[PDB]
Every structure is written in C-alpha cells, then in structure tokens.
Design an enzyme around this catalytic site. Structure first.
Site, PDB file in Angstrom:
ATOM      1  N   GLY A   1       0.760  -1.214   0.041  1.00  0.00           N
ATOM      2  CA  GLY A   1       0.027  -0.080   0.146  1.00  0.00           C
ATOM      3  C   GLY A   1       0.846   1.107   0.083  1.00  0.00           C
ATOM      4  O   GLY A   1       1.859   1.166  -0.382  1.00  0.00           O
ATOM      5  N   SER A   2       0.383   2.464   0.388  1.00  0.00           N
ATOM      6  CA  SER A   2       0.609   3.845   0.252  1.00  0.00           C
ATOM      7  C   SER A   2       1.952   4.034   1.373  1.00  0.00           C
ATOM      8  O   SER A   2       2.883   4.680   1.009  1.00  0.00           O
ATOM      9  CB  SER A   2      -0.334   4.751   0.469  1.00  0.00           C
ATOM     10  OG  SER A   2      -0.914   5.029  -0.690  1.00  0.00           O
TER      11      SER A   2
ATOM     12  N   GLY B   1       3.064   1.373   3.866  1.00  0.00           N
ATOM     13  CA  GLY B   1       3.264   0.283   4.545  1.00  0.00           C
ATOM     14  C   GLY B   1       2.967  -1.175   3.414  1.00  0.00           C
ATOM     15  O   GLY B   1       2.511  -1.063   2.347  1.00  0.00           O
ATOM     16  N   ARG B   2       3.094  -2.306   4.262  1.00  0.00           N
ATOM     17  CA  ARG B   2       3.001  -3.605   3.678  1.00  0.00           C
ATOM     18  C   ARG B   2       2.847  -4.622   4.401  1.00  0.00           C
ATOM     19  O   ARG B   2       2.832  -4.390   5.946  1.00  0.00           O
ATOM     20  CB  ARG B   2       4.352  -3.941   2.669  1.00  0.00           C
ATOM     21  CG  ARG B   2       5.574  -3.994   3.387  1.00  0.00           C
ATOM     22  CD  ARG B   2       6.795  -4.247   2.599  1.00  0.00           C
ATOM     23  NE  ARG B   2       7.690  -3.256   3.158  1.00  0.00           N
ATOM     24  CZ  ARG B   2       8.912  -3.403   3.079  1.00  0.00           C
ATOM     25  NH1 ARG B   2       9.457  -4.332   2.057  1.00  0.00           N
ATOM     26  NH2 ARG B   2       9.797  -2.329   3.710  1.00  0.00           N
TER      27      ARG B   2
ATOM     28  N   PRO C   1      -4.635 -18.211   6.399  1.00  0.00           N
ATOM     29  CA  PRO C   1      -4.329 -18.595   5.323  1.00  0.00           C
ATOM     30  C   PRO C   1      -5.312 -18.760   4.104  1.00  0.00           C
ATOM     31  O   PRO C   1      -4.899 -19.160   3.066  1.00  0.00           O
ATOM     32  CB  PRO C   1      -3.597 -19.890   5.633  1.00  0.00           C
ATOM     33  CG  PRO C   1      -3.983 -20.231   6.937  1.00  0.00           C
ATOM     34  CD  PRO C   1      -4.458 -18.972   7.731  1.00  0.00           C
TER      35      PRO C   1
ATOM     36  N   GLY D   1      -7.112 -16.643   2.671  1.00  0.00           N
ATOM     37  CA  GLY D   1      -7.529 -15.680   1.486  1.00  0.00           C
ATOM     38  C   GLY D   1      -8.564 -14.897   1.736  1.00  0.00           C
ATOM     39  O   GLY D   1      -9.363 -14.742   2.756  1.00  0.00           O
TER      40      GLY D   1
ATOM     41  N   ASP E   1     -13.955   0.912   7.668  1.00  0.00           N
ATOM     42  CA  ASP E   1     -13.393   0.329   6.492  1.00  0.00           C
ATOM     43  C   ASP E   1     -13.931  -1.007   5.967  1.00  0.00           C
ATOM     44  O   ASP E   1     -13.029  -1.644   5.302  1.00  0.00           O
ATOM     45  CB  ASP E   1     -11.709   0.356   6.563  1.00  0.00           C
ATOM     46  CG  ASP E   1     -10.992   0.402   5.247  1.00  0.00           C
ATOM     47  OD1 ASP E   1     -11.430   0.792   4.349  1.00  0.00           O
ATOM     48  OD2 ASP E   1      -9.793  -0.159   5.271  1.00  0.00           O
TER      49      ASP E   1
ATOM     50  N   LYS F   1     -15.182  -3.444   3.395  1.00  0.00           N
ATOM     51  CA  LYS F   1     -15.140  -3.857   2.139  1.00  0.00           C
ATOM     52  C   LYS F   1     -14.764  -5.476   1.983  1.00  0.00           C
ATOM     53  O   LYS F   1     -14.195  -5.873   2.994  1.00  0.00           O
ATOM     54  CB  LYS F   1     -14.116  -2.986   1.348  1.00  0.00           C
ATOM     55  CG  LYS F   1     -12.772  -2.987   1.867  1.00  0.00           C
ATOM     56  CD  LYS F   1     -11.897  -1.922   1.475  1.00  0.00           C
ATOM     57  CE  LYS F   1     -10.395  -1.613   1.959  1.00  0.00           C
ATOM     58  NZ  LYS F   1      -9.498  -0.991   1.000  1.00  0.00           N
ATOM     59  N   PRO F   2     -15.113  -6.035   0.775  1.00  0.00           N
ATOM     60  CA  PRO F   2     -14.702  -7.516   0.729  1.00  0.00           C
ATOM     61  C   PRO F   2     -13.250  -7.875   1.059  1.00  0.00           C
ATOM     62  O   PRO F   2     -12.967  -9.041   1.346  1.00  0.00           O
ATOM     63  CB  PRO F   2     -15.299  -7.975  -0.480  1.00  0.00           C
ATOM     64  CG  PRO F   2     -15.960  -6.778  -1.128  1.00  0.00           C
ATOM     65  CD  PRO F   2     -15.728  -5.454  -0.447  1.00  0.00           C
TER      66      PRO F   2
ATOM     67  N   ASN G   1     -11.189  -6.819   3.226  1.00  0.00           N
ATOM     68  CA  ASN G   1     -10.780  -6.748   4.632  1.00  0.00           C
ATOM     69  C   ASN G   1     -11.333  -7.942   5.181  1.00  0.00           C
ATOM     70  O   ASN G   1     -11.415  -7.934   6.631  1.00  0.00           O
ATOM     71  CB  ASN G   1     -11.266  -5.384   5.449  1.00  0.00           C
ATOM     72  CG  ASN G   1     -10.191  -4.344   4.688  1.00  0.00           C
ATOM     73  OD1 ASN G   1      -9.036  -4.503   4.406  1.00  0.00           O
ATOM     74  ND2 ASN G   1     -10.511  -2.914   4.999  1.00  0.00           N
TER      75      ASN G   1
ATOM     76  N   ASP H   1      -7.441  -4.990   9.159  1.00  0.00           N
ATOM     77  CA  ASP H   1      -7.113  -3.405   9.075  1.00  0.00           C
ATOM     78  C   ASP H   1      -7.889  -2.440   9.700  1.00  0.00           C
ATOM     79  O   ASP H   1      -9.010  -2.046   9.366  1.00  0.00           O
ATOM     80  CB  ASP H   1      -7.260  -3.396   7.449  1.00  0.00           C
ATOM     81  CG  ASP H   1      -6.619  -2.110   6.903  1.00  0.00           C
ATOM     82  OD1 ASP H   1      -6.134  -1.330   8.004  1.00  0.00           O
ATOM     83  OD2 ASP H   1      -6.412  -1.591   5.962  1.00  0.00           O
TER      84      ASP H   1
ATOM     85  N   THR I   1     -13.425   3.449   1.564  1.00  0.00           N
ATOM     86  CA  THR I   1     -13.306   3.271  -0.213  1.00  0.00           C
ATOM     87  C   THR I   1     -14.457   3.919  -0.891  1.00  0.00           C
ATOM     88  O   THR I   1     -15.603   3.589  -0.306  1.00  0.00           O
ATOM     89  CB  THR I   1     -13.087   1.872  -0.579  1.00  0.00           C
ATOM     90  OG1 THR I   1     -12.533   1.757  -1.869  1.00  0.00           O
ATOM     91  CG2 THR I   1     -14.035   0.802  -0.347  1.00  0.00           C
TER      92      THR I   1
END
Ligand SMILES: Cc1n[nH]c(C)c1[C@H]1C=C[C@@H](O)C1
EC number: 2.7.11.11
Length: 339
Positions: free
Chosen positions: A41-42, A44-45, A113, A115, A155, A157-158, A160, A173, A190
C-alpha cells in the site's frame, strides 16, 4: 435479554483496562525470518514471517514513519495499534506483538491462510443468500461488539474480510478505526462503500458502518456493488441519490432489509433507531439465523478454503520483494512516542 447485556458490560470493562494502560515493545525484528510479501500500500506492507525460536507463522504489518507523517496518518496509526491491543472477539484478527525502531512501526498479527473474501467472491461470481447470510451475521455481531465500546470501524469492504481454516470470517485493517462518543469528521474509506453523510462533509456517527453493511450484503448476493460507476465523482452522485436497482433473483425479504440499511436519511436507517441492532437481528431475512450458535462457531460453514498448512501462501498473489531497511539515525521519534 439480560445475558446479552451482561456479556457487553464485561466486554467493555476488559477493553477499558487495556485502553488505559497499553502494551508496548513486546518483540523485535531479528526474532523473525522474512518469507513473502502478502500485500502492499501507500505507507506500508504486510509480510509473512516465521518466529525463529517457536517456528510459528505471523502476518507482520510494517509502516514507514516518514511516509506516515507525509500522508498525514499519524493519529490514524496510533488509533490502529491502541485499539487492536485492547479488543478481543471471535471474528477479529488478533494482535500478538508490537514494536518500533529507527525507521518503522510493526504490528505482528495472526496469519489467516484462506485468502480474502474478495478473491473467493470474484472466482465464483456471486454467493447464494444462505452463504451471504452466514458472513453477514458475523459482521452484525462484530459491529454490535465494537459499537458498544464506542468504536467506529470505517473500512468495511470484501478485501478486509479473511476466511479462516473453519470457513469463518476474521476482520483485518484497523487503520481507520476510532473511539468516538458523539460525532467525527474525517474523509476516509473506499468510494463504493461511503455513506452519503461522509460524501457531504457532515459530522457523522456509527450509522456509517450499518450503511456499509448494506453495500457488502448487496455485493455478496449480486456479484457487484449497488452504486457502481466508472469514476468516483459518478459513484458519489449515485450514492447521494440513493436510487438502488435490485436484481430480480433477490428475495423480497432481502430487498426490504437493503432498503432500510441503504437509507439516505441517517435518522431513519436500521441500526440507528431506538431498538439499535435488534431491528436488524429480528428482520425476516435473518429468521433462520441462530445468533448464539454463530458466536460459538458451532454452525457448519458454506465452504472451507483449500490450503496445505499454516505456511501456505497459495491464496495470495505475487508482489515485488523490497528491503526492510532500518536507518542508523532515529526518525520522527517525537510523533510516535506513545506507540
Ligand atoms: C493474510 C493476513 N493474515 N493476517 C493479516 C493481517 C493478513 C493480511 C495480509 C495480506 C492482506 O490481504 C491481509
């Protein structure tokens, strides 16, 4: 029912004890081996890591302090860590360690794990109403818990919602989560999931999370979101009009629940009336749901994700692998004193 009231009273006592005395500095970077980048992301990771002494796997979120400052996310980053170290609920990803060094902030979370829900939805096209209802019931209980602590999530959204080894949801998140006793004003989230009062720059409250639940249930059951358009400006025009078209395959009960969650007037919106979350839990679309069995994880899930073990990354995609560099000089020490 008094049993639910006493559950939420204890939940708030336990949250406030950790909120008032937060944990700090509970690991360091060279206690872990780096395996793979799982998301970026903007500022971080998130990286898959392995703890060198125990062999346990974790998902480590790494934020660059200088970039957090430049993108004006200092307060949001401090909110995320202080809230995550204080909460405890079956459908929230758990924070296991946190620490900082000269360059970065680190939050070491459990690794899920199976997804993102987003990947599985796009694979299969759309979920049946029973399948959508199983996931929606977990979000209703999670928001009942967070809102009773005076927390707004902001936040939904699918991407997260992660699917775990039993096929249940874990929410990730907390970068926009905040403790709010009245109103708040920041523009965040979003575009497809924003409530009208955020787009119109009003002081808003927990009712924005119930609007976002209406968007999520629609997207799970249709395969696409209700206010879809090619550019943000056009999405925002559809949202504040609130005109919604429903697929003919939706049931009459589903359409009725979505008209009451996607209500443009926040003073008429389900979740925000005198009876609070019970107007949602008692709606006809949820008549087959056993709320206690879901909380206790005793319902068989709609499907179990395919993966080989706690270190399998097959359900995540591939990103360029970059260094985790740590400067010889301290950066932004004052701004992050409390982390
Ligand atoms: C997987 C996972 N388990 N725990 C966390 C915090 C994650 C993130 C990594 C990539 C994002 O899709 C979600």
């Amino acid at each position: 029912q008094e049993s639910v009231k006493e559950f939420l009273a204890k939940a708030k006592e336990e949250f406030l004890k950790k909120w008032e005395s937060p944990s700090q500095n509970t690991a360091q970077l060279d206690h872990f081996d780096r395996i793979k980048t799982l998301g970026t992301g903007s500022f971080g990771r998130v990286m898959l890591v392995k703890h060198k002494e125990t062999g346990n796997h974790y998902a480590m979120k790494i934020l660059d302090k200088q970039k957090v400052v430049k993108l004006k996310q200092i307060e949001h980053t401090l909110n995320e860590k202080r809230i995550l170290q204080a909460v405890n609920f079956p459908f929230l990803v758990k924070l296991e360690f946190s620490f900082k060094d000269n360059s970065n902030l680190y939050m070491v979370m459990e690794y899920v794990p199976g997804g993102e829900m987003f990947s599985h939805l796009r694979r299969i096209g759309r979920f049946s109403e029973p399948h959508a209802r199983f996931y929606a019931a977990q979000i209703v209980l999670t928001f009942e818990y967070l809102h009773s602590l005076d927390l707004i999530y902001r936040d939904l959204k699918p991407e997260n919602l992660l699917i775990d080894q039993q096929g249940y949801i874990q929410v990730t998140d907390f970068g926009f989560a905040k403790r709010v006793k009245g109103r708040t004003w920041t523009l965040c989230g979003t575009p497809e999931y924003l409530a009208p009062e955020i787009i119109l720059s009003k002081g808003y409250n927990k009712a924005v999370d119930w609007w976002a639940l209406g968007v999520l249930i629609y997207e799970m059951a249709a395969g696409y979101p209700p206010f879809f358009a090619d550019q943000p400006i056009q999405i925002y025009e559809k949202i504040v009009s609130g005109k919604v078209r429903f697929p003919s395959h939706f049931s009459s009960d589903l359409k009725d629940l979505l008209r009451n969650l996607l209500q443009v007037d926040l003073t008429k919106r389900f979740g925000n009336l005198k009876n609070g979350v019970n107007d949602i839990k008692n709606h006809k679309w949820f008549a087959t749901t056993d709320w206690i069995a879901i909380y206790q994880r005793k319902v068989e899930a709609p499907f179990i994700p395919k993966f080989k073990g706690p270190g399998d990354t097959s359900n995540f995609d591939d990103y360029e692998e970059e260094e985790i560099r740590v400067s010889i000089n301290e950066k932004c020490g004052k701004e992050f004193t409390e982390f």
